[PDB]
Amino acid sequence: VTAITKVEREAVLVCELPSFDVTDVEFDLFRARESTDKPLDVAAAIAYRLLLGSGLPQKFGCSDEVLLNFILQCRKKYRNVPYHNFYHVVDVCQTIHTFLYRGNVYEKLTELECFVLLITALVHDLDHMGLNNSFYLKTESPLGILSSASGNTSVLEVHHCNLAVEILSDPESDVFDGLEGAERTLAFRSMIDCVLATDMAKHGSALEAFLASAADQSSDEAAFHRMTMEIILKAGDISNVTKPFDISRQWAMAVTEEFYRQGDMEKERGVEVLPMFDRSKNMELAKGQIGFIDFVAAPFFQKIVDACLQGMQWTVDRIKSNRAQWERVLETR
Ligand SMILES: COc1ccc(C2=NN(C3CCN(c4nc(N)nc5ccccc45)CC3)C(=O)[C@@H]3CC=CC[C@H]23)cc1OC
Numbered sequence: 129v130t131a132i133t134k135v136e137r138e139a140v141l142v143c144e145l146p147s148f149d150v151t152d153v154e155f156d157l158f159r160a161r162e163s164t165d166k167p168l169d170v171a172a173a174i175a176y177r178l179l180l181g182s183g184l185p186q187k188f189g190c191s192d193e194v195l196l197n198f199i200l201q202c203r204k205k206y207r208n209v210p211y212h213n214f215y216h217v218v219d220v221c222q223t224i225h226t227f228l229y230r231g232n233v234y235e236k237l238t239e240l241e242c243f244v245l246l247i248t249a250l251v252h253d254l255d256h257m258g259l260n261n262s263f264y265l266k267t268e269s270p271l272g273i274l275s276s277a278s279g280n281t282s283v284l285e286v287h288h289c290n291l292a293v294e295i296l297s298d299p300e301s302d303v304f305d306g307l308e309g310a311e312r313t314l315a316f317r318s319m320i321d322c323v324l325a326t327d328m329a330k331h332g333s334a335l336e337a338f339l340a341s342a343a344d345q346s347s348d349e350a351a352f353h354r355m356t357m358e359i360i361l362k363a364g365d366i367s368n369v370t371k372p373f374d375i376s377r378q379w380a381m382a383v384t385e386e387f388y389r390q391g392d393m394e395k396e397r398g399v400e401v402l403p404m405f406d407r408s409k410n411m412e413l414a415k416g417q418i419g420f421i422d423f424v425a426a427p428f429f430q431k432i433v434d435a436c437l438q439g440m441q442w443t444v445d446r447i448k449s450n451r452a453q454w455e456r457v458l459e460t461r
Pocket residue numbers: 326328365366368369376379380381383416417419420423424
């Protein structure tokens with residue numbers, strides 16, 4: 129399929145990104161994009177550098193050549209939407225790295241499992257089209273029909289897995305080619321399982337199952353590793369509120385635009401439009417983020433940190449302080 133080539137290849141290798149430390153919890157992807165004419169080659173380099181620097185691809189007989197083909201193969205599959213673009217999955221990959229190596233979550237998993245997670249971040253939203261699963265079902269869209277007929281409500285997540293598998297059948301872009309037997313099976317199994325678990329419809333059930341496993345010393349060990357990978361991918365996804373406020377705010381600008389556009393399309397089609405998707409209300413960013421923090425993200429991070437993931441306490445602290453900063457935008461309005 130397609131083939132990347134040196135033209136695109138080198139176009140990434142000749143980015144050096146001197147101003148930053150990709151390993152830092154305060155790494156700023158917004159700066160990186162802004163700091164060149166080629167934001168797409170910069171993002172790729174950040175992924176490339178993160179993966180190579182972990183020394184995980186080498187360990188699992190993944191050469192640099194195949195690695196970069198893989199990244200680049202994913203990039204093509206991402207579109208140009210406000211939020212669910214290739215910058216979001218590069219973000220997720222970089223954030224997951226910080227949770228593994230600064231939050232010491234590496235200790236709870238094998239190297240293969242850390243390698244799979246870093247990879248899975250990049251395939252997790254392949255060919256996302258700005259539109260949530262709901263839209264596909266309410267518009268009786270062909271992908272919603274296929275999902276509905278096929279027995280799986282996770283319209284996009286199955287889509288992303290399909291594309292991810294595609295990319296890896298080609299061995300010049302197959303970052304698991306060096307795995308054999310049980311390891312290769314696990315890599316695909318867990319990668320798919322993780323991606324499917326990013327469907328926010330399943331958020332409660334996946335959080336309650338990870339916690340019940342974490343509190344049980346007799347939990348099946350393979351099942352705990354798996355749920356931990358699922359929880360970490362989920363964490364990367366909702367990690368925007370754990371960043372430095374200014375980075376957080378810009379993430380929230382991007383999603384708020386993306387939601388607005390779906391809601392524009394939901395008006396045209398004539399289908400139901402939720403409050404959140406409606407440009408008609410200015411819809412105070414502050415109150416949106418405060419609600420997202422109180423109902424989804426603060427309880428999530430606090431609970432997994434306490435159960436198990438004590439190294440990630442900083443996520444709970446930054447949420448707490450990002451919240452207080454939104455309350456001070458309210459108090460001074
Ligand atoms: C930067 O800031 C955001 C980034 C991503 C998302 C994402 N949001 N969501 C939904 C998650 C659940 N929601 C709310 N639920 C419940 N119980 N209460 C709420 C109260 C107030 C607002 C929302 C909710 C709806 C949105 C996705 O599904 C995206 C796709 C995948 C993962 C997360 C994304 C939201 C952001 O800020 C609002």
